[PDB]
Amino acid sequence: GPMGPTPFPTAATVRDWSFTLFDRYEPVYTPMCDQCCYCTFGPCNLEGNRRGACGLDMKGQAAREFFLRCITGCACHSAHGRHLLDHIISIFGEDMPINMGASNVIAPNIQLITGRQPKTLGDLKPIMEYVEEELGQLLATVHAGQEGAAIDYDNKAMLAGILDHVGMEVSDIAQVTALGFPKSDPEAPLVEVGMGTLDASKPVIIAIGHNVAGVTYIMDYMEDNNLTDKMEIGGLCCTAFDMTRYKREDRKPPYAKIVGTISKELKVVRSGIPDVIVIDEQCVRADLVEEGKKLKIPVIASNEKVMYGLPDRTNDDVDAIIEDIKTGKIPGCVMLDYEKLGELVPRLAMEMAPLREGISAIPSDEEMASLVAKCVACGECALACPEELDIPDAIQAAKEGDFTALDFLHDLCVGCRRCEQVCNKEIPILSVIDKAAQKAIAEEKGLVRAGRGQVSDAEIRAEGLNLVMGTTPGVIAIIGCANYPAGSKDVYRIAEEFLNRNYIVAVSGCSAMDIGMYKDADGKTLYERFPGRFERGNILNTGSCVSNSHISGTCHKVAAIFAGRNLSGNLAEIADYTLNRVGAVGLAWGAYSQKAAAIGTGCNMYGIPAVLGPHSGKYRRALIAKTYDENKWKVYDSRNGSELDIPPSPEFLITTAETWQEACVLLAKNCIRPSDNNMGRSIKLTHWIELSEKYLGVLPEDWWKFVRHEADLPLSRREELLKKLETEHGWEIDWKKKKIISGPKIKFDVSSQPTNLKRLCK
Amino acid sequence: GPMGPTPFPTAATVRDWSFTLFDRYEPVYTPMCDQCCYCTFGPCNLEGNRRGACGLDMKGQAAREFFLRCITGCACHSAHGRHLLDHIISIFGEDMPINMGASNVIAPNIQLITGRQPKTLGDLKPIMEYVEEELGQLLATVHAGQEGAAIDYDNKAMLAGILDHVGMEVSDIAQVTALGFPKSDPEAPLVEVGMGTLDASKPVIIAIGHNVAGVTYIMDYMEDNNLTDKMEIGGLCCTAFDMTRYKREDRKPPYAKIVGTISKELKVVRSGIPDVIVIDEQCVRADLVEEGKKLKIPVIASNEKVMYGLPDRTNDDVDAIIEDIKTGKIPGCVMLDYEKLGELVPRLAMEMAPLREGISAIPSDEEMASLVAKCVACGECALACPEELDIPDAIQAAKEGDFTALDFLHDLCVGCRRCEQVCNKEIPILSVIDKAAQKAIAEEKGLVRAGRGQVSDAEIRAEGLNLVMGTTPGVIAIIGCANYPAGSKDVYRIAEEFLNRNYIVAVSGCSAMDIGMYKDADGKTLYERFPGRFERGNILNTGSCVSNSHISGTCHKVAAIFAGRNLSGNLAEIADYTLNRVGAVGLAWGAYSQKAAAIGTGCNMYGIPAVLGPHSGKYRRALIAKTYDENKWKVYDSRNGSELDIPPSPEFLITTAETWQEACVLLAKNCIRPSDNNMGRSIKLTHWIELSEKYLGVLPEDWWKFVRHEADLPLSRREELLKKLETEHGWEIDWKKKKIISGPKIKFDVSSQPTNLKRLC
Amino acid sequence: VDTTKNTKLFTSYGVKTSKAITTEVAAKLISKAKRPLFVVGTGVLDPELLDRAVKIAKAKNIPIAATGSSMPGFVDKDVNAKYINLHQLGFYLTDPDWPGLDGNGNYDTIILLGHKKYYINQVLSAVKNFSDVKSISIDRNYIQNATMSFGNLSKADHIAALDEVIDLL
Amino acid sequence: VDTTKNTKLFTSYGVKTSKAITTEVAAKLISKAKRPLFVVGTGVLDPELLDRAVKIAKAKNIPIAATGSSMPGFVDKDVNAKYINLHQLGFYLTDPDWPGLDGNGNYDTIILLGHKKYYINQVLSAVKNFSDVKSISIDRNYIQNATMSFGNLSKADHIAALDEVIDLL
Ligand code: SF4
Ligand code: SF4
Ligand code: SF4
Ligand code: SF4
Ligand code: SF4
Ligand code: SF4
Ligand code: SF4
């Protein structure tokens, strides 16, 4: 029916909104290099904001690099979605209706961007097509001499981010509708997570990747032959969530297990636990064969994206492949036929379990003593460590029978092996750390909730009242990868702190795995302490990486439920509404991948601020606003069209934080919105002040910038803060009524409607 | 009809063919950078083939970088094709029959790859769709942890290259069947090209880029308003060739002019000649706004890919935009409305011509005497020069009154002003060089034949015998950009030398317009001297590099029209035929862009070896064969299925050469195929030995490997070569009746058929 | 105690590199700063590092930007310290019009102590490429993107160097 | 003449840079080499560089590999110069099973002269990162990818350094 101005958008159509965002949130470029390696006219030295042979300055180069990362992430999501959709339509038919959950808008991102309302599975076919076409255009911008300004690369990156969100939504909708995933279930079944959950007394299959097509066939073969009680299947990365959501809408406990994030990927292979490894698409270490052939661990590729230089045995007989892998020259094969793979992997694991027994890279106690005695403290390993761990100090401590420093370093290490390749003594430091933390690994057991899907249109209404009556301080979306600066406990600490204050915490991806890994002193995890509903003090795990499209979609639904705004082709309107009214902040503590960059950029284009880990400064682009400049904090009143002041929150669209206390303070502060009433503003100020005092020893210096009314102040210390306002700031206050009569620079008016667009003013 | 075994190929469908190719031609990785910087786990130092935090080694990283370049070029060509097809369909509909000339295989690359034979302009719509899909499935591989083998990356890069030749094919097909281009015309009109071919007392419109979509509107506005004589329209890069070919099926000479390649861009801006500049999509300098604003040159962007951060004034009135630009309130504008742009550009040029008279960046003699004396010879400019020119020496010579050093430097300089940013004396070195070379810039005139399009069926049928048998010594496809190492005359010299030797020379892109800039004593270019039919001794121009596919398509026609092979879905068999029996070689002496890399990779998948300039060594991957291994030169027989030995030619699929003499020797040597008869091998050996003795100064050290019979040698030197074979290699040759009793390694057989596929024997 | 010895890196940001200075040069540069800003990180919470940082800041009355969660260390102390994000500080330092923490104007030279390499290097890239604010690194890691920096040092060597710099301020 | 004073570069491949060496060090390395190869490019057609290269080759009977168009400069010079493509030579030097130009085997160290900086650097990247062949660049430029290299010099200083090397061999 009614359509907005931007259906099927391009770089020109979303230029106005992106430019409006960049006028307030200026881009900050932190180049990862002083040179350009792109074309034979180079490499060009752009240091000091100089120009290349093509006239491109270093700011433009950084913008182009970030744009390339965003489009690579978008391409990954869209290609995974396209392959999943094609397989699903081939197997289940093109007329299958979309069954996502109890909702009014089943595809909020698709409706928001394209303007269409898909009903069946085939309705998703054109949308994917559009995305891929646009991808080509965007990819054409990576060519040399294809853009001169950095702002035009930032706008194209924003377009790439929103297209990425569309692709993730398409993929998740297809997979959930087809493979019987949980449909917005607040009581999703719990699944074990950790390296100490795989019983080494049974054959072990380990699936690494992000797809689920072949994993479903493997599980079907296991179930049909009743091998589920004697063979253990584990998942690394998002395929663990995808396999633990398979047919789990009935809440039956799943036999599949979750091993961990990318960090564990090599470590498990080092332990000899896996008996067969299958690799699907992405987040797969490019040296699994190198460290697996040493332990006689077969590695099987299953997708054309990743063939790992292996022989292609697709058109063959399973028995011959089994015999060659068992006693032969090939450490694996590429098996692109899904039925053949689902039949081959279980039999191969069964026949390899009794033959690879007693093989692991963990050194003996005497072997580890000799290894720790071999070091000379040359400092190369600490120089090559991505996390800058103090390896030589730990080795020096362990030289005298003190194996606890390596035990501490085990959690901080990411298992990247970069320290081993610079050691002239050939000391396997990763295996040394694993040997020192063997007992801790054996103790690693946790529980996580399976992917519920999207948030239903009933929980949003149930939580809107709590958000407007000042009982829900905001929404925190803990997502991203697992390249943490100081171990996997930081996400757990942040989630626990925000759940203790009755926030709405939504988790997905590797962060959910690394949060559900720390049991409490009572032997409980956060998912068991707090239910999986969309309500205050509750934590819900949406699912795999492609489930993040739901979280952003949730924001869109808030615009489409309480305000009644049209979603079809209304990117600018809904983005403005989310930026001005909805209090939701994303947190990507360990993001490394280009997919994380695409997700963060797409969230920024929807108006959702994000705080990332200290490593994310390597992404070369952030979006920060100048607090001091008062002329960049003005909007229009959608009733008068006049200029209206707003508090300086959110003060960034994407930023980085070093420690988790700083992240907690930033997340608490950035939940504030200009349109907040007295109760919401009061509760947000309360929590922000409390967190600042607890984690910084001081209370914020800009708190007074968020006090429009005497009801804006916290309840506990109202008089203590009013006295400070009168004394430190000189405001005029009445003491009998405890009322601020003068001093605020913005009079409270709940009916005011902030807008960044002049085209929607009376 | 009868369809081959690879319908709509993917990574796995062409994996076997790529592996077969790389079994003979190993990939040589020459990485440009010792670190990987893709994800935040890095920067990962990969020096010494060490693996990164994700397990990728340095060879894998180099392969990934080359694959990224290839897919970038392929996506650029495919996006150009998609935009052109959409815009053309929005005017002429979607049921317009395709007419590329007189032939039956209208789309060779499309039929070879997708097995489809489109006949209407809308029938190309699905093809692009397929390509777009594959593009995504390749770009996802750039993500960290999506592939861990350099060989698989190379296979995917070759697939991207072929999907880049398909995109170029569709682009050229649409733009030729719609806009009225020459239709395989062997008598295309001559076109004035050069710096001095443009006037200066008239308004000037300079079109930079690759999209002839707004240039068409400008040209119609100028022709229907009788402005073809009152102003000048010049073009740079391939948009010049496309603009010239526009509406030129009537063979009348065009009024549009060609200024030069990309290396001339800033130069033109610094000359003050242009009165307006319109930038479309590709090969556009990123600092035109700054220099144009310094020289008060309006800049208009008419595309979504290139916007420059200029205001979007598509919905604004033309008069208001013209007034704002004239009064200097904005440095330029963005206009996506072609109808508005075609009226705005000429009017803006006409109004701005009498407003910037006497405005230029060329220094006066006294200023070029002061700036030259300002230098203190610190050597930073020579360090920062991509072409490694002795700028301080030239400036020192200028301090003595001799300005010939800078005049000689002018041709070698690609005009990138990279020097001017490192000079602490703030000397406009490019401007100084242009001032010292003004006397030659004034003479920069020449003629180039416009793009013919494709090759007609009659020419292919006539030349198939001479090509497969070898009567024509070979085909040289001079393609690529203008990032030359030692000036733009090397390509002209190579083309002239090979045209004098009865070779077929096909040109396209910037090299086509750079060859015709040099004249002989009579003052005529190579295009005027030699005709433009697909015959020995003639030189033909295909135009823009989107027409480059035609050259590759030409080879496919030879494999299909003559031998009767089936094109549909038969990439492996056709590529095998071209590698085994067709004598063709490509030359990219100045390749710099990702499009050139994609084109080269696609050509290498088709079995066409390529020689590139030294700068192409920064492309991070070549394909070279081991000449000292006899196990890499074994094939099978199509009649018996038994092993067969072949001469080690070509010794590479892509490589680089330091100088143009070495390039000539390589092109001469790599045109020899195992299937040539005695006459073809004799002619090829004659040319190779003559070129080697003329340029390298010594007779080749492996010519005796390419001899199987007594008729395989040149007749004028047959006795001398018999003596040379007898005294050194100790062969048995009968002196009474000239015949080789014994000594060779491969025995002659006219009916022998070499194949690299065991499934075809 | 010689700091300009181990100028060793794992990866390089380009050709331009930091200067490895001695204790005397660092003391002279700190004492000659027109308007210094002691940018400190969460890694200064080590008691020796915290004491040395407080002594350095109070010796020359240098205002402190306690980036990260380093504010609780300075609450009990006397040095004028304010909290600010390191990324936000890097964005602000590239603006000549920034009033600063005191509102008296933008700063000239920033002293860095107690930071992670991959973070401070990323911020210093923008700071050193899009501004003219000088950076002096007195950390035990060799920072490439700083204008001047110490070399790779042991913890005892770093403590000794900081003590010598204190005695030479 | 001092050859280890100017090592300025425009760009850098990475942390591992070439060692700056003197004339005496280069002479000692060339004398100690067991099976050296003299890889000359088309830039040894200079009237002076050709004489220096011929003297160097005749001093130690080093076989010459001429790349590009330098072969005519050795047609009648009484040396052992043979033609080979530089890219092909760089690929073959990474294969230990190469018979070599002479026919005995591969080589241990190669001396570079008369090359273009970018081309020789790109060709040497593969040799440095994928083989164990040492590189001695005696050219006028500072090649980073070489094992040992002369620093940046003027033409007169380049000639003086080459003459000093010859007189010390
Ligand atoms: S960004 Fe990476 S690849 Fe590009 S020049 Fe810098 S180090 Fe090299
Ligand atoms: S793209 Fe531009 S900056 Fe990069 S290498 Fe090429 S000319 Fe230099
Ligand atoms: S690299 Fe090896 S020898 Fe050097 S400090 Fe580390 S563990 Fe010890
Ligand atoms: S494997 Fe662990 S300890 Fe070694 S460099 Fe990588 S993160 Fe550091
Ligand atoms: S992609 Fe791999 S090699 Fe490159 S920076 Fe990331 S972890 Fe390191
Ligand atoms: S950079 Fe400038 S001062 Fe230095 S040598 Fe070149 S022209 Fe002379
Ligand atoms: S403008 Fe010319 S002389 Fe200057 S650096 Fe570029 S190519 Fe060299």
Residue numbers in the entry:
A (entry chain A): 40 to 801
B (entry chain B): 40 to 800
C (entry chain C), D (entry chain D): 2 to 170
From the study:
Carbon monoxide dehydrogenase (CODH) and acetyl-CoA synthase (ACS) play major roles in the global carbon cycle through the consumption of CO and CO2 gases, production of acetate, and breakdown of acetate for methane generation. By contrast, methanogenic archaea employ four copies of CODH (α2ε2 heterotetramers) and eight copies of ACS (β monomers) that interact stably with eight copies of CFeSP (γδ heterodimers) to form a massive 2.2 MDa complex called the acetyl-CoA decarbonylase/synthase (ACDS) complex. ACDS plays a central role in that process, wherein the A-cluster of ACS cleaves acetyl-CoA into CO and a methyl moiety, the C-cluster of CODH oxidizes CO to CO2, and the corrinoid of CFeSP receives the methyl moiety, which is reduced to methane in downstream methanogenic metabolism. Through plunge freezing of the ACDS complex, we captured multiple subcomplexes including a CODH tetramer, a CODH/ACS pentamer, and a CODH/ACS hexamer and characterized these subcomplexes via cryogenic electron microscopy (cryo-EM).
